[PDB]
């Protein structure tokens, strides 16, 4: 009762302005995503030129998938941290997260920085077509 | 890793590179032309298996253990010989000590599937 | 910086080769090289596979072997002695260090190097598994 | 390798399908135009309207079609009548506006009178054809 | 049977009807016949498996297909004249069927979509960049066409989490409005 | 089957919509019409067999 | 690794070479020419060894 | 060694089965439904490539150069004919979802040369 009737004075909202970041944070997110895509391209090139030595305990496919997932997870974590550092005290996503009432830091990172990797049964999106995820890609495309 | 190899199940399915049956009625002149004086040291049919270095050295196995396991599992009916540890060609030859072709096929299936090194 | 070796695909990182060239060109930077190498060797990388951690330790130990071959001998063997008994490092790493050292060194040897390298080769967890016979024969006949 | 001397045609469809053999197609079309210039409009007027497909590749053939339409008299009158009657049979090709443009480009009191006669014949036919004639006139005006 | 190995098997509605020794020009001819509304109707699926030599032609019912623009030499076959004719759709009686009969759009089903190199937008058809591909065969008419009736009501559905789009597709069937104009009778 | 065992051909996907057909109103009503026309013919046999044992002609409307 | 055929309105599984000989091809060149189109591939010949052996 | 195929009878044209005779010490290929026998040109009665490192370049046909869904490179010219454009792809065999080795096919229709970088 006391907290609701004080909230009548203080108020609590959420809107578009809580979902945006400044231009510097957007440049950091885009730089991290570009760096990650370049790293995945380099790992693809290394596996394609047979310069990728497999890790012990798994074949070339599993070590390539592990390297790609490591790069994409590192990108997701870095972009999430960069989005979290841009939040002000007045941010309402942060207000609901750090009160524990609703949401998480992952939700803020997905709204602001990057949604991330979509998974089906613990792996990336499978080649439902003939060596393609969709007909808009080339065959044997293992990129992000 | 030594205990891991002592625990993990290993047959010839996971250690040989390719197996082949030939016809060698005269062991003094073998059809593969690979050290017939070693072949000097009874059925005309032989079972010739070939191993690979990587799977042999992963389990740290040697041909003496495999040959003794073959002899223990099959009695005196099978004669196994082995050489070329330093010649980069991992070969064991198995003959029959006294229609035989189906028997070699059956014992080859048994060696590759149903006996444990 | 954490999550660096996790993002390295090659067997040996290029910066470790930069350390190798630093040790090759100059000898005054050898304590700094060894300090960085023991900092990385003592670091636990929980984000890597256990075999990936083991081969990373082997790579750092290869850099240590190069540092030993470039004249900075006694502190490296002292660190391996420290790692053997009063530290819980992998005995396979110590055996790999002994194998790498004994494949590049030839007689004669000094008294200090023999006195510092003999106890790690007679620790009952190294000598039995692990040429080394020529080295122990030379150490027995000379020292 | 001959012109006319038959009732139906077989090399017209072969040269049309083989066109993308493009050099002999022009020679075959020129031979057919020279044979039909003397005119024999009972079957050589509807079968002469071969289905085209290339515009940029067959711009030279479209230009030579203007010389093929210069035979005049019956060879132009029956061709214009067939081109007018082709609109009632769902002429879904480039021969409904570009082929009629060659007659329109050579409208030296020939295409106008023939078009007026075709409009009078269409009006004298069954009803619900004034909209088709108006659409054809609008398309001829906008295309030319 | 010695000629089977080099030639391409041809299946019509799953029935092996023979072999062809020149499958590329045969598939070009079959495509040219289908684009021109010839004896091959527009809903006939013609799939050429290239890695293993087969050509499958499907004619039966039940095949789910969608229209796609046709891309040749990194250029749309759809030109400004088709759009200009479609603008006065009720005037010159130019329709969707005339757009199909012009060889501009064609219906690609799922099996034929395996063999289709497809552009999402005509902005993918630019040779100035590396362009990621230069052998595009088809283009999307619009990428939003993948949604159904209920999902097309969602404004900005690409800015929502996907289960919320699913929930809205469920609850748009429960909304109140005027369900039909003749509800009085 | 051999190419699948050799591995030269990938195994077929059951959920691939190229391997699936949609039975619309037409095919479903055609299946029903096949069953019911077979039934209608069957009682035409029944009626004609009942009326042919007496040697009398039978009306098709009946 | 024998190849078998499950037939409609037959309860028990039927070897494929028996079906091929039942179609009117009493040979092995005919059946294997219908099955294997390339004689320079001996691996398919190895995998059709046991069906012919069981259909002896 | 190498894989052994089917060799066929001459009269009934069935497959020739291997048979052993006790007089000549040579392998015989006897068809056992019309007793036709044949001399054995090879002693390899049966081989089994169990590692089956198959040559994927043999399994690739040159027709895939005109697949529109395959990517292209101008950076790997054809060794046989010098054409710069070539398609590339990975192997699709069941034994090859453990490597990402590229296989190239020349785009030029005359040669269709396939290789591996
Ligand atoms: Zn025979
Ligand atoms: Zn070439």
Curated annotation (Swiss-Prot), chain C:
- GO molecular function annotations of the record: RNA binding
The family this protein is said to belong to: Belongs to the NELF-D family.
Which keywords does this chain's UniProt record carry?
Nucleus, Repressor, RNA-binding, Transcription, Transcription regulation
- Tissues and organs where the protein is expressed, per its UniProt entry: Widely expressed. Expressed in heart, brain, lung, placenta, liver, skeletal and cardiac muscle, adrenal, thyroid, kidney and pancreas.
- Name it: Negative elongation factor C/D
Q: What does this protein do?
A: Essential component of the NELF complex, a complex that negatively regulates the elongation of transcription by RNA polymerase II. The NELF complex, which acts via an association with the DSIF complex and causes transcriptional pausing, is counteracted by the P-TEFb kinase complex. (Microbial infection) The NELF complex is involved in HIV-1 latency possibly involving recruitment of PCF11 to paused RNA polymerase II.
List the signal peptide residues. Answer: none
GO terms for cellular component: membrane; NELF complex; nucleoplasm; nucleus
Q: Where in the cell is it found?
A: Nucleus
| Subunit structure and binding partners | The NELF complex is composed of NELFA, NELFB, NELFCD (isoform NELF-C or isoform NELF-D) and NELFE; NELFA and NELFCD form a stable subcomplex that binds primarily through NELFCD to the N-terminus of NELFB. Binds RNA which may help to stabilize the NELF complex on nucleic acid. In vitro, the NELFA:NELFCD subcomplex binds to ssDNA and ssRNA in a sequence- and structure-dependent manner. Interacts with ARAF. Interacts with PCF11. Interacts with KAT8.
Q: Which GO terms describe its biological process?
A: negative regulation of transcription elongation by RNA polymerase II
Curated annotation (Swiss-Prot), chain D:
Indicate where this protein resides in the cell: Nucleus; Nucleus membrane
Q: How does it assemble?
A: Component of the Integrator complex, composed of core subunits INTS1, INTS2, INTS3, INTS4, INTS5, INTS6, INTS7, INTS8, INTS9/RC74, INTS10, INTS11/CPSF3L, INTS12, INTS13, INTS14 and INTS15. The core complex associates with protein phosphatase 2A subunits PPP2CA and PPP2R1A, to form the Integrator-PP2A (INTAC) complex. Interacts with ESRRB, ESRRB is not a core component of the Integrator complex and this association is a bridge for the interaction with the multiprotein complex Integrator; attracts the transcriptional machinery.
The entry's family comment says:
Belongs to the Integrator subunit 1 family.
What job does the chain carry out?
Component of the integrator complex, a multiprotein complex that terminates RNA polymerase II (Pol II) transcription in the promoter-proximal region of genes.
Q: Which disease is it linked to?
A: Neurodevelopmental disorder with cataracts, poor growth, and dysmorphic facies: An autosomal recessive neurodevelopmental disorder characterized by severe global developmental delay with motor impairment, cognitive delays, absent or severely limited speech, dysmorphic features, hypotonia and cataracts.
Protein name, per record: Integrator complex subunit 1
- According to its UniProt entry, this protein's organism is Homo sapiens (Human)
Give the encoding gene's name: INTS1
Q: Which residues of the full protein are shown?
A: 357 to 506 of 2190
From Swiss-Prot, chain H:
- The zinc fingers classed as C4-type run over 9-34
Instruction: Could you list this entry's UniProt keywords, alphabetically sorted.
Output: Acetylation, DNA-directed RNA polymerase, Metal-binding, Nucleus, Transcription, Zinc, Zinc-finger
Keyword Metal-binding applies? yes
Name its cellular compartments: Nucleus, Nucleolus
Q: Where does each TFIIS-type zinc finger lie?
A: 74-116
Q: Can you tell me which residues bind Zn(2+) 2? A: 78, 81, 106, 111
**SMART domains the record matches:** RPOL9, ZnF_C2C2
Note the InterPro entries from the entry: DNA-dir_RNA_pol-M_15_CS, Rpa12/Rpb9/Rpc10/TFS, Zn_ribbon_RPB9, Zn_ribbon_RPB9_C, Znf_TFIIS
Quote the Gene3D superfamilies the UniProt record gives.
Answer: 2.20.25.10
Q: Which GO terms describe its biological process?
A: maintenance of transcriptional fidelity during transcription elongation by RNA polymerase II; transcription by RNA polymerase II; transcription initiation at RNA polymerase II promoter; transcription-coupled nucleotide-excision repair
Supply one GO CC term from the record: nucleus
Which residue ranges traverse the bilayer? Answer: none
Q: Summarize the subunit comment.
A: Component of the RNA polymerase II (Pol II) complex consisting of 12 subunits.
State the similarity comment. Answer: Belongs to the archaeal RpoM/eukaryotic RPA12/RPB9/RPC11 RNA polymerase family.
Described purpose of this protein according to its UniProt entry:
DNA-dependent RNA polymerase catalyzes the transcription of DNA into RNA using the four ribonucleoside triphosphates as substrates. Component of RNA polymerase II which synthesizes mRNA precursors and many functional non-coding RNAs. Pol II is the central component of the basal RNA polymerase II transcription machinery. It is composed of mobile elements that move relative to each other. RPB9 is part of the upper jaw surrounding the central large cleft and thought to grab the incoming DNA template.
Name of the protein: DNA-directed RNA polymerase II subunit RPB9
